[PDB]
């Protein structure tokens with residue numbers, strides 16, 4: 003029933019300093035408490051962009067489109083803009099390098115019907131796959147908010163999504179971003195154009211996932227107005243600034 | 254059948270420059286080639302000590318003694334020498350902190366028969382469980398060499414051990430030590446005793462596991478004579494010095 007939230011506007015300074023606007027949403031699993039700088043934007047739905055690689059990988063694995071994390075998806079020989087895309091990949095490296103063509107191929111093999119069914123089963127954002135089956139998450143109807151991403155991520159973390167436990171374990175392994183002796187970050191980045199509303203030429207960068215600690219899990223979903231195009235850099239820095247500020251990860 | 258090894262004594266400087274003796278054994282998976290500073294010690298069998306948490310976790314999970322990585326093993330209320338042991342644990346934290354009492358309880362639930370059967374099925378070291386069912390890896394008959402650890406680890410990495418794929422995925426998750434954008438280290442430390450002619454006990458520290466790269470896996474198993482300085486820290490430092498020397502991981 004009732005969810006505990008804390009609004010801490012002081013995190014806005016991490017965005018303003020970097021000449022940006024954004025939202026950081028955190029969920030403390032043990033305490034069942036959420037923290038955000040912006041309760042309105044925490045609840046504003048956007049294109050997931052490459053954060054859609056998480057349900058996309060889950061569906062592809064569950065349907066047998068992807069056998070395991072080691073299966074090689076050979077480069078189709080077409081030179082694309084990102085050098086790391088122009089080579090063979092497996093699920094781990096396709097996630098790590100956000101290799102859009104690999105995921106577009108998974109989408110096509112999944113198909114509209116199964117893709118739609120699965121997103122409804124995952125209760126994923128607005129569950130709308132309007133547009134091309136191989137690009138709806140980049141330029142179609144799918145919309146998700148930062149709080150809805152956390153909601154989805156919490157199910158994935160707990161192996162509660164309506165796909166096999168194995169599919170969920172493989173995707174969480176593919177999400178592995180950082181680990182040291184204090185914490186483990188399992189997350190995915192996304193960058194796309196604002197199609198939700200009439201905000202032309204602007205870009206929405208995401209960073210969604212979680213921080214595993216010895217005795218707790220801190221889910222996060224963040225998005226910001228990108229000052230440039232298609233890259234990260236700042237996202238992780240702002241999120242880590244918030245996590246350090248909140249005494250979650252050490253300084 | 255025949256195993257290719259390269260002996261590189263130059264790594265001895267990483268041992269001597271920390272006033273220690275020991276062995277680093279590496280296995281390049283793609284090239285099927287081994288590298289060591291000491292071919293004799295690479296093959297010398299020792300008590301596995303806490304490196305035994307790897308087969309122990311696999312057996313406990315496969316037999317249902319451990320349901321999953323989140324199951325809480327409550328502290329038995331007995332204050333032990335290591336503060337982190339005097340608290341509740343799950344499989345992740347029990348591995349991370351080498352919580353011996355948690356593993357001793359698993360061992361007792363497993364039993365001699367199933368423990369013996371499983372170690373023979375894993376072709377684990379000398380497969381001898383002589384001594385107490387809950388301490389044989391600390392003060393019993395079990396012996397394993399650095400090359401035999403690599404042999405075991407390679408089967409685990411490939412999900413080739415005669416336990417479920419799930420058990421193997423859970424243990425590899427529990428082994429997660431470090432990850433960044435270049436590599437992933439999944440490993441386990443151990444500290445065993447050694448009988449000396451004087452009547453006391455010398456300590457032999459282990460660090461076994463692997464380094465996952467985009468396109469290769471470097472297995473490692475190291476052991477050294479533990480000095481009266483730091484303790485644990487050195488093992489990782491020496492291994493990382495070797496991995497950096499060998500151009501496996503960046504500086």
Ligand SMILES: [F-]
Pocket residue numbers: 327
């Ligand atoms: F209790």
